[PDB]
Amino acid sequence: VWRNTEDEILKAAVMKYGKNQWSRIASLLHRKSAKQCKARWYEWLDPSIKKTEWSREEEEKLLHLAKLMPTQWRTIAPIIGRTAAQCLEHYEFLLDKAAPNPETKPARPDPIDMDEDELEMLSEARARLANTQGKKAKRKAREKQLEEARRLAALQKRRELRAAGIEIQKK
Amino acid sequence: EVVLHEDKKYYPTAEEVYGPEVETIVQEEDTQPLTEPIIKPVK
Amino acid sequence: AKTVTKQRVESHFDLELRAAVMHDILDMMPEGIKQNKARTILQHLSEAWRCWKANIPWKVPGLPTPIENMILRYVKAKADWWTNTAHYNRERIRRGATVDKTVCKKNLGRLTRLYLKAEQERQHNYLKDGPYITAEEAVAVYTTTVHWLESRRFSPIPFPPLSYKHDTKLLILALERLKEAYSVKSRLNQSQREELGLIEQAYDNPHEALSRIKRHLLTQRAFKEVGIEFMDLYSHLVPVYDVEPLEKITDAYLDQYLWYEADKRRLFPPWIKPADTEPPPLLVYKWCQGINNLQDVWETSEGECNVMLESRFEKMYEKIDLTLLNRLLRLIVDHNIADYMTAKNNVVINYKDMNHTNSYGIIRGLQFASFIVQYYGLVMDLLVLGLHRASEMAGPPQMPNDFLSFQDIATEAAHPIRLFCRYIDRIHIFFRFTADEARDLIQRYLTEHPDPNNENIVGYNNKKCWPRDARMRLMKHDVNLGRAVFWDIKNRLPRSVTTV
Amino acid sequence: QLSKQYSSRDLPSHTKIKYRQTTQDAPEEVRNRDFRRELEERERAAAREKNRDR
Amino acid sequence: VKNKAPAEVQITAEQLLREAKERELELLPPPPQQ
Amino acid sequence: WKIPPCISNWKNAKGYTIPLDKRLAAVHINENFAKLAEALYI
Amino acid sequence: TMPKPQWHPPWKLYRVISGHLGWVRCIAVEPGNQWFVTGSADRTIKIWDLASGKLKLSLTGHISTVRGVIVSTRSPYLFSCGEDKQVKCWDLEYNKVIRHYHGHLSAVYGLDLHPTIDVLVTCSRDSTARIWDVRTKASVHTLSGHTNAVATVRCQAAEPQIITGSHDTTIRLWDLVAGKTRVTLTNHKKSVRAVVLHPRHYTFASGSPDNIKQWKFPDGSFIQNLSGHNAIINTLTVNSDGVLVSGADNGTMHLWDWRTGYNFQRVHAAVQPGSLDSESGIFACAFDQSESRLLTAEADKTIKVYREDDTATEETHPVS
């Protein structure tokens, strides 16, 4: 199942990495694979998916299509602009008023005390999202300030060495 | 009057784009095999 | 100044292409004076190319037209180069010239992308130019099938009952078949690991499994997305479909149940022949042995003529229509299972980063696809033979016939079609004509396709493997009879359903 | 500063220049020729042959 | 001991983005003036 | 002559956050389906 | 104003050849006028008959775009030049490469032949030209001094013997023996991709998206402008009768009068069926040897042949 913490990580992860690197994102999450992340995005968390009420024109067109092209919900869904799970639930519901897969379901909210792993993930997700500098661009940034020890130490020690009275030449 | 995707004519044909009198050659593979010199020598 | 050899062909193509682009407009159709941003137009160029490769429609909101035309022109340049290289390497791989192992993989990836681009275009054209099958071909097909099934006294398949006796036998068979893939117990992956987990826990607790299975078959009509990839056989490729585990188990059980029941109620008449009764060499023997046991078959006194035709339905898996297929399945099974089966072929197909939706053909990597292919082929056997001759061949429903036998000799000789075999989508027919039936056929052929210039002898294809003393001898009566027979058969099939 | 290195491909090869002989197309003949009329001649001939084509 | 019970506000994304923004991970301390 | 910047879905060389909306932006049905389906029901 | 321009008849398209699998980038005519040769971005060199338009032969040696071909008037040789940095000499009595000139450091954009001595000149993107010895494949001079790709080169027997136009918007007139630039002409604001020499007048013209300009040898004194064609100009080609063809890169082709600079026709041809409309463009044009036909090599993989119109008169098509 899907927990609000996780899909809130997924919104940010998609916001950062892009809409085609599902294995990276899947790695941000513990206990998720890239297939499930991609499914959850294309079924519920996409901002272009509508969760509203069916306008009367929507419902008439839905029944119209479901008669023109029966059981082809992936074909029908984009013709009216909602996901196939929504169209399928609402069509059976219309038929009955007149008479799993956890990607589709909403997210169980956050608990009062978040289970510790729920917390460390957030910190580490925060960790990953902030590391813009090229992981090596981290290292060499460290190195630029690293060697400043080398020169700064040497000079004072060189000053002191030549101050002690010995005029060393390196070469 | 349904056109099987096997036909699906895009792309107006040449005579319609160029005109009734402009000639149109389409030359895939050539005549005159490669061994035949373009400039023949003397003998 | 080192030459451009074979490892630097691609990197050099891109060097020179983007040098050209930088010359081209970003310095010779400017008047974006300040800083003409050419380093960013090159970014657009690379992204337009990736979008071409992914089959995405690329349109940037406010981007001057001269630039857009420049980019479209150069992406067409690179696309021509790319696919011409694919054509060339494919011919080398097919005939056998290179063994390089990076070219084999590069080329399989190129042709996978080319296939999926053509395929998304074919599905879009379906949904745009509408069902290719008119409402009068489809109604003839539907009514002919109802007449068949009613004359046979078929007994439709019911939804698998609650306390069916055989549910565990059908489940054990399904799960053994699914295990048979990972016999090796290889390095497999996460996803096969997960499948093996599901299979084992269903092998331990077989009633939560079957409860789930029937719940699925009853309520589910929108499924996950399928993966595709190609198996490279060096002279053609084979598509290989990758479905998810939960549904693979539900489909395997549905498959077993349908084939079991179909075989008990006798759906498939004896000519639909990858059958469980003999291996293919025994089919060849029974065919040779049935031809020879026809009545007065080798006699030529009165000018009779035997014709053996063999063909292929030329793409039946690809022009199935899921609406018509739904209705044709409903005549056979419960509407619940029919709806499951036809709502399952309509899924999203995904390769590396290309995605589309199946709406027209059939996914053969499903587990009941055998049943769909053979039932649809049954409908087409009926269109080719006619209900009367199909009822002569299949015998009366109380006393069915064997593979190539008839009830008596009277019926067998009452018609030119003496034998008929149909492998999955392959057709073999054997006719025996009298001189008047043959002459009549040739007349009606020549009336509509008149060949006064005697080039019918030319298109005829023979088998250049036996010596000429054993090949076919092309006299005009003979090649004309051949063309007439073929012309007559390819006229019984609407070209929007299948061809020949 | 001239090197003594050397190359397999800089050995002498094709050391004589062919000149266009008397009949091939020497600059004398093309200096002479009348080209427009010759061209229209072969053009008419080709149209004749291809109407014989059909 | 764990008590599962609906939390109060939420852990919506912008919060992750703002906290990572304020993690400043390695901007860099300035090269020391001497 | 202003050139919009590219935000790709494949390359994020410098690791930059872009909101979903701007990340995002950068069907026909014939009328013979009705005649076919209704002819089948009849 | 001007005296008034000579009346030239207008030209009409009459043939469309299509057999190439990439843009067609260069075109040339044999000395004796029987066949012409095209080189394309599908790395072949096709040889077509000039009367019938039939394809005689296809030569495939290059590794990338062939960007220039030429046929030598003194020897049975065809010299081709590609983007693979290689320059080739095909011998046309065996149809096989016999000689290759090595040393350029990037794609070679064009090439011309000296009319009396046996040398070659090639221009490339490393922003140099080279004077090759046809017979010993040795580079006798590297004409350097431009500061960007050298788009085009033309050579002549008179003096100065080499004119190069480059992408850094400059023209240079070089001396062959000394090997250095005499004159530098900086009148153009945009890349000079086209240069042509009048056959019988000791003058020359140079094309650029700004406007075509005319110059007068041997030290390049300005003469006049030719304006109106606002397009990246890929070619210029002059008839012996003073017709000057200016072929652009969006497909449009203007025909001018050389002497007064009066644009007497504008052709806007159509793209081959399966083409986009962003793929109309002219890369090379060549007059026949009789100077009656005008062949053009286009970015929609066709070769279009124009002939003069014989049924028009000064009063049907007056000169403005």
The DSSP string of G187-237 is --SS---EEEE-TTSSEEEEE-SS-EEEEETTTTEEEEEE----S-EEEEE
- Contact pairs from chain B to chain G, CB under 8 Å: 76
C75-98: b or e for each residue (b if 16 or more CB lie within 10 Å)?
bbbbebbbeebbeebbeebeeeee
Contact D21 B40 (CB under 8 A): no
Contact yes or no for G238/G196 (Cβ under 8 A) = yes
Contact yes or no for C377/C313 (Cβ under 8 A) = yes
Give the technique used to solve this structure: cryo-EM
Contact yes or no for A162/A168 (Cβ under 8 A) = yes
Beta bridge partners of G212: G226
Sheet holding C237-242, edge to edge: C237-242, C226-232, C348-351, C354-357
Residue C122, burial from CB neighbour count under 10 angstroms (0-12, 13-18, 19+):
middle
Contact yes or no for G199/G158 (Cβ under 8 A) = no
Contact D39 G99 (CB under 8 A): no
- Interface mutation vs chain C, best among F21, F40, F41, F42, most C CBs within 10 Å: F40
Q: Do A39 and A64 have their domain in common?
A: no
Q: Do A82 and A54 have their domain in common?
A: yes
Contact yes or no for G188/G169 (Cβ under 8 A) = yes
Q: Do A66 and A82 have their domain in common?
A: yes
Q: Which residues are within 8 A (CB) of G157 and not within 5 positions of it... i.e. 6 or more apart? A: G114, G115, G116
Task: Confirm or reject contact between A33 and chain C (CB < 8 A).
Answer: yes
How far apart CA F41 and CA F12 sit, in angstroms, is 53
Closest CA to C296 of C470, C412, C140, C460: C412
Tokens read off for C369: 């696809």
Pairing relationship of beta strands B23-26 and G11-18 according to DSSP bridges: parallel
- Counting as contact any 3 or more CB pairs under 8 A, the partners of G are B, C, D
How far out from the chain centre does Cα C249 lie?
Answer: 23
Residue C467, burial from CB neighbour count under 10 angstroms (0-12, 13-18, 19+):
exposed
Q: Rounded to whole angstroms, what are the CA distances from G25 to G31, G223, G296?
A: 20, 30, 10
Q: Which helix (H) or strand (E) holds C240?
A: strand C237-242
Q: Which residues are within 8 A (CB) of C267 and not within 5 positions of it... i.e. 6 or more apart? A: C154, C332, C375, C378
Contact G136 D15 (CB under 8 A): yes
Q: Rounded to whole angstroms, what are the CA distances from G280 to C3, G251, G273, G276?
A: 33, 5, 12, 8
Which residues in chain B are immediately followed by a break of C to N over 2.5 Å?
A: none
Amino acid sitting at position C7: Q
- How many residues are there in chain F? 42
The SS3 call for residue B17 is helix
User: CA end-to-end span of chain F, whole Å?
Assistant: 60
Comparing CB atoms, the residue among F8, F23, F29 nearest residue A15 is: F23
**D 5-44 residues with CB below 8 A of G?**
9-10, 12-20, 24-25, 27, 29-30, 33, 35-36, 38-39, 42-43
Beta bridge partners of G213: G206, G225
Contact C125 B5 (CB under 8 A): yes
How far apart CA A92 and CA A94 sit, in angstroms, is 5
Q: Do A33 and A59 have their domain in common?
A: no
Distance from CA of C423 to the nearest CA of G (A): 40
Range of the domain at A33: 1-49
Chain G residues within 8 A of C23 when measuring between CB atoms: 149, 167, 191
Closest CA to C180 of C166, C192, C189: C192
How far apart CA C480 and CA C120 sit, in angstroms, is 41
Instruction: Tell me whether the omega of the peptide bond preceding residue G218 falls within 30 degrees of 0, making it cis.
Output: yes
User: DSSP letter at F15?
Assistant: -
The SS3 call for residue C163 is coil
Cα angle B20, B23, B28 (rounded to 5 degrees) comes to 135
Pairing relationship of beta strands C305-312 and C426-433 according to DSSP bridges: antiparallel
Q: Which helix (H) or strand (E) holds C282?
A: helix C280-291
How far apart CA C1 and CA C234 sit, in angstroms, is 38
Contact yes or no for C444/C487 (Cβ under 8 A) = no
Pairing relationship of beta strands G171-175 and G180-185 according to DSSP bridges: antiparallel
Q: Do A55 and A12 have their domain in common?
A: no
Task: Confirm or reject contact between B8 and chain C (CB < 8 A).
Answer: yes
How far apart CA G31 and CA D26 sit, in angstroms, is 9
Q: Which residues are within 8 A (CB) of G177 and not within 5 positions of it... i.e. 6 or more apart? A: none
How far apart CA G227 and CA G217 sit, in angstroms, is 21
Contact yes or no for G53/G305 (Cβ under 8 A) = yes
Tokens read off for C69: 């035309």
Contact A75 C359 (CB under 8 A): yes
Closest CA to G34 of A92, C129, B38, C151: B38
Tokens read off for C488: 């007559």
Distance from CA of B38 to the nearest CA of G (A): 6
Sign of CA dihedral C398, C404, C406, C412: positive
Give DSSP secondary structure letters for chain A: --BHHHHHHHHHHHHHH-SS-HHHHHHHSTT--HHHHHHHIIIII-TT---S---HHHHHHHHHHHHHSTT-HHHHHHHHTS-HHHHHHHHHHHHHHT----SSS--B--BSS--HHHHHHHHHHHHHHH--S-HHHHHHHHHHHHHHHHHHHHHHHHHHHHHHT------
Q: Do A4 and A41 have their domain in common?
A: yes
Q: Do A29 and A57 have their domain in common?
A: no
Closest CA to C489 of C308, C289, C251, C295: C308
Contact D46 G51 (CB under 8 A): yes
Inter-axis angle of helices C190-204 and C206-219, to 10 degrees?
110
Contact yes or no for G123/G109 (Cβ under 8 A) = yes
Ramachandran assignment for C442, one of left (phi > 0), alpha (psi -120 to 50 degrees), beta (any other): alpha
Q: Please report the beta strands in C297-409, taking only residues with DSSP state E, as ranges in sequence order.
A: 305-312, 348-351, 354-357
- Counting as contact any 3 or more CB pairs under 8 A, the partners of E are A
This PDB structure is determined at a resolution in Å of 3.0
- At least 3 CB pairs under 8 A between chains C and B: yes
Q: Do A39 and A56 have their domain in common?
A: no
The SS3 call for residue C126 is helix
User: DSSP letter at G117?
Assistant: S
Contact yes or no for G120/G79 (Cβ under 8 A) = yes
How far apart CA A159 and CA A151 sit, in angstroms, is 12
Q: Which residues are within 8 A (CB) of F14 and not within 5 positions of it... i.e. 6 or more apart? A: A132, A134
Contact yes or no for E16/A129 (Cβ under 8 A) = yes
How far apart CA G250 and CA G10 sit, in angstroms, is 21
Q: Which helix (H) or strand (E) holds F38?
A: helix F32-41
- Counting as contact any 3 or more CB pairs under 8 A, the partners of D are B, G
Chain B residues within 8 A of D24 when measuring between CB atoms: 39-42
Q: Do A17 and A59 have their domain in common?
A: no
Closest CA to G159 of G218, G200, G113: G218
Task: Confirm or reject contact between B20 and chain G (CB < 8 A).
Answer: no
The SS3 call for residue C76 is helix
Q: Which residues are within 8 A (CB) of G209 and not within 5 positions of it... i.e. 6 or more apart? A: C28, C29, G190, G191, G230, G231, G232, G233
Amino acid sitting at position C89: N
How far out from the chain centre does Cα C204 lie?
Answer: 37
Contact B39 G93 (CB under 8 A): yes
How far apart CA D6 and CA C495 sit, in angstroms, is 69
Task: Confirm or reject contact between B26 and chain D (CB < 8 A).
Answer: no
G223 phi/psi in degrees, rounded to 5: -125, -65
Closest CA to G296 of G78, G110, G25: G25
Q: Which helix (H) or strand (E) holds C167?
A: helix C167-179
Give DSSP secondary structure letters for C390-445: HHHHS--TTS---TT--SSHHHHTSSSEEEEEEETTEEEEEEEE-HHHHHHHHHHH
Contact B4 C122 (CB under 8 A): no
How far apart CA C250 and CA C210 sit, in angstroms, is 9
Closest CA to C78 of C45, C108, C111, C107: C45
Contact yes or no for G130/G138 (Cβ under 8 A) = no
Comparing CB atoms, the residue among F3, F27, F35 nearest residue C32 is: F3
Contact yes or no for C345/C360 (Cβ under 8 A) = no
Q: Do A2 and A43 have their domain in common?
A: yes
Give DSSP secondary structure letters for D6-38: --GGGS--S-S-----HHHH-HHHHHH--HHHH
User: DSSP letter at E6?
Assistant: B
